[PDB]
Each structure stands twice: as structure tokens, then as C-alpha cells.
Amino acid sequence: ETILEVNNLKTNETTPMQRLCFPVSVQSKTGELCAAFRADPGRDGPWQSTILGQLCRYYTQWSGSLEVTFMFAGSFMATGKMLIAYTPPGGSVPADRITAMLGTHVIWDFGLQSSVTLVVPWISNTYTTGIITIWYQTNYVVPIGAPTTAYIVALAAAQDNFTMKLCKDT
């Protein structure tokens, strides 16, 4: 499990240390979107920073299952709920929290746990895009003294059925 770069904005090019974590806050409302990213290791994007997306550049075709592990780095006295939705390939991006709950999703509350693992069923490359959206289920509540913002670090690794062939020099 190596670290991704989900927060690849235009203003983070000068300070590249902020590209490893995306922030949550109190002022964000409920039922809104926090982050969204593709699930392709070959093409450019958030998967260029992992070792899975750097060794698949030496090949052409790959097929198998992946997993994405999130990690919370907030205060101990804070609690809340997040929604980690996954759309099937060929579908559309959800517009709100309601239609994203009907698909494949997991409710992750960081008041009890600290890491959630979302497993992608199958990807292939001969669109096939596996968009994972981060939704705000409940708002971020903190007591007095606790910090208002926190950060989530996303990791990514492959399963035991991820094969590749057709070696190609970059």
C-alpha cells in the first residue's frame, strides 16, 4: 500500500508536500462531495504517484482487482461519518448522496475505526473507469480545543489476481 496523490491541484505545484492529503472541515455542509478520482493505473492522474501505476507503464495490458485504503489523521475527540461510493464502469457520476448509496458503497465512521478498505472488483485495459467519490454523510463535529480541519491519506495496492503482459519500453 503506497500513497496516492489525490489532491493534485494547480496551486500545490510550488509546495508538493500538500499533495498527499485532502482536507476535511467543519464549514462543509452535509450531502456534498469532497473528492473524486479515476481508478486507472496506466493513464495520468492520481495513480502516477503509486508503485502500481509506475510498473504498469512497462507493460500494455493489465487486468485484476485493486484495493484502496484510507487513513484518518485527525483528533481523537472528533467524530463523524463519510461515504465511500464506487460506480461500475460504464455508468455515470452520481449527482447527490442519494443515488450514490444505491450502488456499491461503504459507510466509514472515524469515531470508532481509523482505516477503511474499499476493494475494486475488476478493471481491464485492452471507457473502463472506476470513479470513487467521497461524500459527506454527517458533518464534522469537534469539541472546544480540538482542531477544526483534519486530513485523510489515501493508499492503494493490488490484489493477488492482478496480472499483466505485453512488455513495452517507455
Binding site: 496523490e5 478520482f37 492522474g45
Partner: protein, 197 residues
Amino acid sequence: HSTQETAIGNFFSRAGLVSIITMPTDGYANWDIDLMGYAQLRRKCELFTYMRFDAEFTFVVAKPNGELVPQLLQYMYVPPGAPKPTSRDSFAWQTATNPSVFVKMTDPPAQVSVPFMSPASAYQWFYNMMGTFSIRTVGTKKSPHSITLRVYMRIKHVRAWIPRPLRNQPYLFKTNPNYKGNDIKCTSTSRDKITTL
């Protein structure tokens, strides 16, 4: 399917060009054997720390434009710890301890295998001298033909240890892994917002 294509032996197959030597009308060249000679085969070898293998060379020799002439050549391999030839008619060309081959230009190219020549148990890129080659034309007179050749190198019996993060910055020197401090380019590509899929 099976997992044979992603093995460590097939990842270092399909021998490519490692050197190019042009000898126009001095008469001798000295090419040191080094893996980090191009952008390729340096990022692929820096994925690990300890490597153990043998070498396999091929000397495809021709004229600068296609054709071949009946000329006799000599490819002398200098062992690690032996003096290099400093002239065309030096005493190092007749040294019996330095093995050499004698092929022509109208000959299929030579196939020379160089074994594991390190005093340790494996090679080390982060802290070897595998050898040097010397190429000259035989005879005591200047041959009136421009000679050029390219060397292809295969890597057999690959064994790797201690995987390492891959280099994403361009190289500046070939002795140390240096980078430029005026800018740090991002590994990933950027977008306008984190919500735009």
C-alpha cells in the same frame, strides 16, 4: 493466465544498444563497460539495490553507410585490474592474460559472455568495475576504411534484492543521484479542482 511475463528474468531480457563507437580514418578505442549509459536500463536497474548476473555482448560492425569490406578486426577484453592499451602498437595487445576474438566484417557478429566479475556477492549501485573493451584493426598499416560498430548487451540469470522507490527526477551526473534544487517537478499531473472527474 500465468505470472511468467512479470518474472525477474524476463524483465531484463531483449538486449538493446548500450554503446556506439565511431572510428574514422587514432585507430583504437577504449570503451568502459557500464550499464548506466542511457536513460533506459538505469531507471530499471535502480528499482533494486543488490543485483547478481552475467553479461552477454554482441558487436555488430559495418561501414557508416550499409556496406561491408573484407577487414579483419580484434576485440580485446581487459580484465579488472589490468593496464589498458595506450597506443595502437602497445605491448598490451599481445598480452596472453587478456582474452580477445578475431572476426571479420563479412562474418556474423561475435557472441561474448562475461561472467560475474565482482569480489562481493552482488553488484551495488548505491554506496564494481566489470571491465573495459578495446577495439582495433590488425596490421601495421593504416586501413583506408572508416569503421563504426554498436554493442548490444543481454543480462542473464537475474537475481534482485532490496526493492527501492523508482526515480522520477531527471539525472544530471552519472556517479551520484543528484537533482536540481531550483524546481521540483510533480510526479502526477494536476487538475483544476478535486471534484472534476
